[PDB]
Protein backbone atom coordinates (compact mmCIF):
# COMPACT_ATOMS: atom_id res chain seq x y z
CA UNK A 1 0.00 0.00 0.00
CA UNK A 2 1.36 3.39 -1.09
CA UNK A 3 -0.92 5.56 1.06
CA UNK A 4 0.44 7.87 3.74
CA UNK A 5 0.96 5.93 7.01
CA UNK A 6 -0.78 7.15 10.16
CA UNK A 7 1.43 7.66 13.22
CA UNK A 8 -0.34 7.41 16.59
CA UNK A 9 1.95 8.09 19.54
CA UNK A 10 0.13 6.27 22.35
CA UNK A 11 0.65 8.37 25.43
CA UNK A 12 -0.63 7.36 28.84
CA UNK A 13 -1.78 10.96 29.37
CA UNK A 14 -1.93 12.52 25.90
CA UNK A 15 -2.10 10.64 22.59
CA UNK A 16 -0.80 12.33 19.43
CA UNK A 17 -2.16 11.25 16.03
CA UNK A 18 -1.26 12.47 12.58
CA UNK A 19 -0.03 11.54 9.14
CA UNK A 20 3.60 10.68 8.51
CA UNK A 21 4.07 13.52 6.01
CA UNK A 22 3.39 16.29 8.52
CA UNK A 23 6.24 17.89 10.45
CA UNK A 24 4.10 18.08 13.63
CA UNK A 25 1.30 16.02 15.17
CA UNK A 26 -1.70 17.82 13.73
CA UNK A 27 -4.03 16.01 16.16
CA UNK A 28 -3.46 15.35 19.85
CA UNK A 29 -5.70 15.08 22.90
CA UNK A 30 -5.77 13.60 26.41
CA UNK A 31 -5.98 9.82 26.76
CA UNK A 32 -9.16 9.39 28.76
CA UNK A 33 -12.87 8.73 28.37
CA UNK A 34 -15.28 11.13 30.05
CA UNK A 35 -18.70 9.78 31.00
CA UNK A 36 -21.55 11.70 32.66
CA UNK A 37 -20.93 11.86 36.39
CA UNK A 38 -24.49 10.80 37.27
CA UNK A 39 -26.06 7.62 35.93
CA UNK A 40 -28.25 9.31 33.33
CA UNK A 41 -31.60 7.69 32.56
CA UNK A 42 -33.69 10.84 32.01
CA UNK A 43 -33.61 12.94 28.84
CA UNK A 44 -31.97 16.33 28.42
CA UNK A 45 -28.72 15.39 30.19
CA UNK A 46 -25.31 14.91 28.54
CA UNK A 47 -26.16 12.46 25.76
CA UNK A 48 -23.82 10.05 23.98
CA UNK A 49 -22.26 8.87 27.28
CA UNK A 50 -18.73 8.88 25.73
CA UNK A 51 -16.89 12.23 25.67
CA UNK A 52 -13.39 12.09 24.18
CA UNK A 53 -11.08 14.91 23.15
CA UNK A 54 -12.03 18.59 23.32
CA UNK A 55 -15.69 17.69 23.84
CA UNK A 56 -14.67 16.32 27.24
CA UNK A 57 -12.86 19.62 27.82
CA UNK A 58 -16.00 21.62 26.99
CA UNK A 59 -18.12 20.13 29.81
CA UNK A 60 -15.25 18.89 31.97
CA UNK A 61 -16.96 19.84 35.23
CA UNK A 62 -19.88 17.45 34.74
CA UNK A 63 -17.89 14.37 33.65
CA UNK A 64 -16.24 11.49 35.45
CA UNK A 65 -12.88 10.76 33.83
CA UNK A 66 -11.37 7.31 33.26
CA UNK A 67 -7.93 6.79 31.75
CA UNK A 68 -7.57 3.52 29.78
CA UNK A 69 -3.78 3.37 30.09
CA UNK A 70 -1.93 3.23 33.41
CA UNK A 71 1.87 2.93 33.66
CA UNK A 72 1.98 2.46 29.91
CA UNK A 73 -0.29 -0.60 30.12
CA UNK A 74 -3.80 -0.70 28.66
CA UNK A 75 -6.29 -1.50 31.44
CA UNK A 76 -9.74 -0.90 29.89
CA UNK A 77 -9.44 -2.35 26.40
CA UNK A 78 -12.95 -1.23 25.45
CA UNK A 79 -11.99 2.35 26.32
CA UNK A 80 -8.76 2.07 24.33
CA UNK A 81 -10.69 0.71 21.35
CA UNK A 82 -13.09 3.65 21.69
CA UNK A 83 -10.11 6.02 21.77
CA UNK A 84 -8.56 4.54 18.64
CA UNK A 85 -11.89 4.61 16.81
CA UNK A 86 -12.23 8.26 17.82
CA UNK A 87 -8.81 8.90 16.28
CA UNK A 88 -10.37 7.75 12.98
CA UNK A 89 -13.35 10.10 13.42
CA UNK A 90 -14.67 13.03 11.43
CA UNK A 91 -13.01 15.26 14.03
CA UNK A 92 -9.54 13.68 13.74
CA UNK A 93 -7.97 12.61 10.42
CA UNK A 94 -11.40 12.38 8.65
CA UNK A 95 -10.36 9.08 7.07
CA UNK A 96 -11.10 5.37 6.90
CA UNK A 97 -8.84 3.09 8.91
CA UNK A 98 -8.60 0.45 6.18
CA UNK A 99 -6.71 2.74 3.79
CA UNK A 100 -3.54 3.68 5.69
CA UNK A 101 -0.89 1.55 7.44
CA UNK A 102 -0.34 2.42 11.09
CA UNK A 103 2.68 2.99 13.34
CA UNK A 104 2.00 2.60 17.07
CA UNK A 105 4.25 3.57 19.97
CA UNK A 106 4.56 1.55 23.18
CA UNK A 107 6.62 1.84 26.34
CA UNK A 108 9.62 -0.50 26.69
CA UNK A 109 9.51 -3.68 28.75
CA UNK A 110 5.71 -3.79 28.57
CA UNK A 111 3.73 -7.05 28.78
CA UNK A 112 3.65 -9.10 25.60
CA UNK A 113 -0.12 -9.56 25.90
CA UNK A 114 -0.58 -5.79 25.70
CA UNK A 115 1.18 -5.62 22.33
CA UNK A 116 -0.55 -8.79 21.13
CA UNK A 117 -4.00 -7.45 21.98
CA UNK A 118 -3.19 -4.04 20.48
CA UNK A 119 -2.19 -5.72 17.22
CA UNK A 120 -5.32 -7.88 17.32
CA UNK A 121 -7.53 -4.82 17.83
CA UNK A 122 -5.80 -2.88 15.05
CA UNK A 123 -6.01 -5.82 12.61
CA UNK A 124 -9.52 -7.14 13.44
CA UNK A 125 -11.77 -4.23 14.41
CA UNK A 126 -9.97 -1.90 12.00
CA UNK A 127 -9.11 -3.56 8.68
CA UNK A 128 -5.72 -1.85 8.63
CA UNK A 129 -3.40 -2.99 5.80
CA UNK A 130 -0.40 -3.21 8.13
CA UNK A 131 0.98 -2.29 11.54
CA UNK A 132 4.28 -1.56 13.27
CA UNK A 133 4.96 -1.00 16.98
CA UNK A 134 8.05 1.00 17.98
CA UNK A 135 9.52 2.14 21.28
CA UNK A 136 9.44 5.88 21.87
CA UNK A 137 13.07 5.94 23.01
CA UNK A 138 14.21 4.79 19.57
CA UNK A 139 12.01 7.44 17.95
CA UNK A 140 13.37 10.35 20.00
CA UNK A 141 16.78 9.95 18.34
CA UNK A 142 15.09 9.85 14.93
CA UNK A 143 13.36 13.12 15.78
CA UNK A 144 16.56 14.78 17.00
CA UNK A 145 18.38 13.57 13.87
CA UNK A 146 21.32 11.97 15.72
CA UNK A 147 22.52 8.37 15.57
CA UNK A 148 23.63 8.04 19.23
CA UNK A 149 22.37 9.17 22.60
CA UNK A 150 20.68 8.31 25.87
CA UNK A 151 16.96 9.01 25.62
CA UNK A 152 15.27 9.80 28.94
CA UNK A 153 11.57 9.62 28.10
CA UNK A 154 9.59 10.81 31.13
CA UNK A 155 6.02 10.61 29.93
CA UNK A 156 2.76 10.79 31.81
CA UNK A 157 2.75 7.17 32.98
CA UNK A 158 6.24 5.67 32.72
CA UNK A 159 9.73 7.18 33.02
CA UNK A 160 12.40 5.17 31.21
CA UNK A 161 16.00 5.70 30.14
CA UNK A 162 17.43 3.90 27.10
CA UNK A 163 21.02 4.21 25.78
CA UNK A 164 21.70 3.72 22.07
CA UNK A 165 25.20 3.85 20.55
CA UNK A 166 25.40 4.25 16.76
CA UNK A 167 21.93 2.77 16.33
CA UNK A 168 22.65 -0.25 18.55
CA UNK A 169 20.30 -0.53 21.53
CA UNK A 170 21.38 -1.97 24.88
CA UNK A 171 18.34 -4.03 26.00
CA UNK A 172 19.95 -4.93 29.34
CA UNK A 173 20.89 -1.31 30.13
CA UNK A 174 17.30 -0.02 29.82
CA UNK A 175 15.95 1.44 33.06
CA UNK A 176 12.26 1.97 33.80
CA UNK A 177 10.28 3.32 36.76
CA UNK A 178 6.59 4.10 37.21
CA UNK A 179 7.08 7.53 38.83
CA UNK A 180 5.93 9.92 36.12
CA UNK A 181 3.61 12.87 35.49
CA UNK A 182 0.48 11.23 36.87
CA UNK A 183 2.25 10.26 40.09
CA UNK A 184 3.53 13.83 40.41
CA UNK A 185 -0.08 14.95 39.99
CA UNK A 186 -1.20 12.60 42.77
CA UNK A 187 1.53 13.90 45.07
CA UNK A 188 0.52 17.46 44.17
CA UNK A 189 -3.05 16.60 45.15
CA UNK A 190 -1.77 15.34 48.49
CA UNK A 191 0.33 18.46 49.07
CA UNK A 192 -2.60 20.69 48.12
CA UNK A 193 -4.70 18.81 50.66
CA UNK A 194 -1.92 19.79 53.05
CA UNK A 195 -2.48 23.36 51.84
CA UNK A 196 -6.16 22.94 52.76
CA UNK A 197 -7.57 22.44 49.24
CA UNK A 198 -9.67 19.42 48.26
CA UNK A 199 -9.63 17.86 44.77
CA UNK A 200 -11.37 14.58 45.55
CA UNK A 201 -13.24 14.22 42.26
CA UNK A 202 -11.79 12.48 39.22
CA UNK A 203 -12.68 15.61 37.26
CA UNK A 204 -10.69 17.64 39.79
CA UNK A 205 -7.71 15.43 38.97
CA UNK A 206 -7.70 17.30 35.66
CA UNK A 207 -7.45 20.74 37.27
CA UNK A 208 -4.75 19.64 39.73
CA UNK A 209 -2.92 18.34 36.65
CA UNK A 210 -3.43 21.79 35.14
CA UNK A 211 -1.97 23.34 38.30
CA UNK A 212 1.02 21.02 37.91
CA UNK A 213 1.48 22.14 34.31
CA UNK A 214 1.05 25.84 35.09
CA UNK A 215 2.93 26.58 38.35
CA UNK A 216 5.41 23.94 39.52
CA UNK A 217 9.19 24.29 39.40
CA UNK A 218 12.16 22.19 40.49
CA UNK A 219 14.44 24.03 42.90
CA UNK A 220 18.19 23.43 42.75
CA UNK A 221 18.32 23.83 46.56
CA UNK A 222 14.97 22.67 48.01
CA UNK A 223 16.03 23.28 51.62
CA UNK A 224 16.95 26.91 50.93
CA UNK A 225 13.71 27.49 49.02
CA UNK A 226 11.65 25.93 51.81
CA UNK A 227 13.40 28.12 54.39
CA UNK A 228 12.89 31.16 52.16
CA UNK A 229 9.40 32.64 52.36
CA UNK A 230 7.38 31.64 49.30
CA UNK A 231 5.63 34.14 47.04
CA UNK A 232 2.35 32.13 47.11
CA UNK A 233 1.59 32.40 43.41
CA UNK A 234 -2.11 32.80 42.65
CA UNK A 235 -3.83 30.44 40.19
CA UNK A 236 -7.25 30.82 38.56
CA UNK A 237 -9.62 27.86 38.65
CA UNK A 238 -11.95 27.21 35.70
CA UNK A 239 -14.95 28.27 37.79
CA UNK A 240 -13.32 31.60 38.72
CA UNK A 241 -12.02 31.26 42.27
CA UNK A 242 -8.34 31.84 43.04
CA UNK A 243 -5.99 29.57 44.97
CA UNK A 244 -2.61 30.25 46.58
CA UNK A 245 -0.50 27.20 45.75
CA UNK A 246 2.32 28.01 48.15
CA UNK A 247 5.42 25.89 48.84
CA UNK A 248 3.73 22.82 47.32
CA UNK A 249 4.76 24.35 43.97
CA UNK A 250 8.29 22.99 44.52
CA UNK A 251 7.41 19.96 46.69
CA UNK A 252 5.33 17.89 44.26
CA UNK A 253 7.88 17.58 41.40
CA UNK A 254 10.68 16.91 43.91
CA UNK A 255 9.32 13.37 44.25
CA UNK A 256 10.45 12.66 40.67
CA UNK A 257 14.08 12.97 41.80
CA UNK A 258 13.58 11.77 45.41
CA UNK A 259 10.44 9.58 45.53
CA UNK A 260 11.45 8.01 48.87
CA UNK A 261 10.21 11.16 50.64
CA UNK A 262 6.67 9.78 50.19
CA UNK A 263 7.80 6.21 50.90
CA UNK A 264 7.76 5.19 47.23
CA UNK A 265 10.30 2.45 46.47
CA UNK A 266 11.58 3.94 43.22
CA UNK A 267 14.96 4.90 41.85
CA UNK A 268 14.37 8.50 40.76
CA UNK A 269 14.81 10.09 37.35
CA UNK A 270 18.46 11.04 37.82
CA UNK A 271 19.15 7.62 39.33
CA UNK A 272 17.63 5.68 36.43
CA UNK A 273 19.43 7.91 33.92
CA UNK A 274 22.82 7.46 35.59
CA UNK A 275 22.36 3.73 36.13
CA UNK A 276 21.29 3.25 32.52
CA UNK A 277 24.50 5.00 31.49
CA UNK A 278 26.68 3.05 33.93
CA UNK A 279 25.24 -0.38 33.12
CA UNK A 280 26.45 0.06 29.53
CA UNK A 281 29.95 -0.90 28.46
CA UNK A 282 32.68 1.33 29.86
CA UNK A 283 34.14 2.71 26.63
CA UNK A 284 30.72 4.01 25.56
CA UNK A 285 29.93 5.70 28.88
CA UNK A 286 31.68 9.01 28.20
CA UNK A 287 29.91 9.37 24.86
CA UNK A 288 26.65 8.39 26.54
CA UNK A 289 27.23 11.29 28.92
CA UNK A 290 28.01 13.58 25.98
CA UNK A 291 24.65 12.76 24.30
CA UNK A 292 21.66 12.83 26.67
CA UNK A 293 18.32 13.55 24.99
CA UNK A 294 15.28 14.55 27.02
CA UNK A 295 11.78 13.54 25.97
CA UNK A 296 8.26 13.39 27.36
CA UNK A 297 6.13 15.98 29.06
CA UNK A 298 7.56 15.56 32.55
CA UNK A 299 10.91 16.85 31.30
CA UNK A 300 9.19 20.21 30.63
CA UNK A 301 9.17 21.08 34.35
CA UNK A 302 10.55 24.53 35.09
CA UNK A 303 14.19 24.24 36.09
CA UNK A 304 14.17 20.50 35.39
CA UNK A 305 17.25 20.72 33.19
CA UNK A 306 19.37 22.50 35.79
CA UNK A 307 18.48 20.09 38.58
CA UNK A 308 19.04 17.06 36.35
CA UNK A 309 22.41 18.47 35.30
CA UNK A 310 23.37 18.99 38.95
CA UNK A 311 22.35 15.45 39.93
CA UNK A 312 24.13 13.86 36.97
CA UNK A 313 27.22 15.95 37.74
CA UNK A 314 27.35 14.82 41.36
CA UNK A 315 26.73 11.19 40.32
CA UNK A 316 28.90 11.02 37.18
CA UNK A 317 32.70 10.73 37.33
CA UNK A 318 34.51 13.99 37.95
CA UNK A 319 35.57 16.21 35.03
CA UNK A 320 33.35 14.36 32.54
CA UNK A 321 31.39 16.31 29.95
CA UNK A 322 27.60 16.14 30.24
CA UNK A 323 25.22 17.41 27.54
CA UNK A 324 21.51 17.20 28.37
CA UNK A 325 20.19 17.99 24.89
CA UNK A 326 16.72 19.28 25.81
CA UNK A 327 14.93 20.31 22.58
CA UNK A 328 12.03 22.72 22.91
CA UNK A 329 9.80 20.24 21.02
CA UNK A 330 10.46 17.39 23.47
CA UNK A 331 6.74 16.96 24.20
CA UNK A 332 6.10 15.87 20.59
CA UNK A 333 9.56 14.49 19.82
CA UNK A 334 8.29 10.91 19.87
CA UNK A 335 5.62 11.55 17.24
CA UNK A 336 8.02 13.55 15.06
CA UNK A 337 10.44 10.64 15.16
CA UNK A 338 7.65 8.24 14.29
CA UNK A 339 6.75 10.41 11.31
CA UNK A 340 10.38 10.53 10.17
CA UNK A 341 10.65 6.75 10.51
CA UNK A 342 7.43 6.13 8.59
CA UNK A 343 8.57 8.49 5.83
CA UNK A 344 11.58 6.26 5.10
CA UNK A 345 11.26 3.62 2.42
CA UNK A 346 12.79 1.14 4.88
CA UNK A 347 9.52 1.33 6.83
CA UNK A 348 7.97 -0.55 3.90
CA UNK A 349 10.01 -3.61 4.94
CA UNK A 350 9.22 -3.25 8.68
CA UNK A 351 5.44 -3.33 9.10
CA UNK A 352 3.67 -6.68 9.07
CA UNK A 353 1.17 -7.22 6.28
CA UNK A 354 -2.38 -8.25 7.11
CA UNK A 355 -1.89 -11.59 5.35
CA UNK A 356 1.36 -12.02 7.29
CA UNK A 357 -0.48 -11.51 10.58
CA UNK A 358 -3.26 -13.88 9.51
CA UNK A 359 -0.82 -16.62 8.49
CA UNK A 360 1.98 -16.41 11.06
CA UNK A 361 -0.45 -15.41 13.81
CA UNK A 362 0.49 -13.51 16.95
CA UNK A 363 4.22 -14.27 17.06
CA UNK A 364 4.83 -12.25 13.87
CA UNK A 365 4.30 -8.94 15.66
CA UNK A 366 6.76 -10.14 18.32
CA UNK A 367 9.48 -11.20 15.87
CA UNK A 368 9.34 -8.49 13.20
CA UNK A 369 10.04 -5.84 15.85
CA UNK A 370 13.55 -7.26 16.34
Amino acid sequence: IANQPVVIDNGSGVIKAGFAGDQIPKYCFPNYVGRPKHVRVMAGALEGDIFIGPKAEEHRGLLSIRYPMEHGIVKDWNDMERIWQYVYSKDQLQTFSEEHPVLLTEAPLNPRKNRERAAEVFFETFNVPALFISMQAVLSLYATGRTTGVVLDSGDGVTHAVPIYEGFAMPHSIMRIDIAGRDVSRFLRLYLRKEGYDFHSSSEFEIVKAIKERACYLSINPQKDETLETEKAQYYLPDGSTIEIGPSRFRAPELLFRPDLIGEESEGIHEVLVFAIQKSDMDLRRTLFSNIVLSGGSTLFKGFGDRLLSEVKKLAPKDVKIRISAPQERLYSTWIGGSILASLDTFKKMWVSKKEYEEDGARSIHRKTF
Partner: peptide, 24 residues
Amino acid sequence: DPKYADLPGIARNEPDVYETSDLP
Protein backbone atom coordinates in the same frame (compact mmCIF):
# COMPACT_ATOMS: atom_id res chain seq x y z
CA ASP B 1 11.00 27.54 14.67
CA PRO B 2 7.53 28.86 13.67
CA LYS B 3 6.47 25.40 12.47
CA TYR B 4 6.05 24.52 16.18
CA ALA B 5 4.42 27.88 16.98
CA ASP B 6 0.86 26.51 16.87
CA LEU B 7 1.43 23.56 19.21
CA PRO B 8 0.20 24.06 22.82
CA GLY B 9 2.97 22.63 24.97
CA ILE B 10 6.12 23.90 23.26
CA ALA B 11 8.14 25.25 26.19
CA ARG B 12 9.93 28.42 25.04
CA ASN B 13 12.00 31.03 26.88
CA GLU B 14 14.39 28.29 28.02
CA PRO B 15 17.81 27.05 26.73
CA ASP B 16 17.86 23.89 24.54
CA VAL B 17 21.15 22.54 26.03
CA TYR B 18 22.13 22.05 29.69
CA GLU B 19 25.83 21.16 29.74
CA THR B 20 28.86 21.41 31.99
CA SER B 21 31.64 23.88 31.28
CA ASP B 22 34.12 22.75 28.65
CA LEU B 23 37.64 21.81 29.76
CA PRO B 24 40.69 21.94 27.48
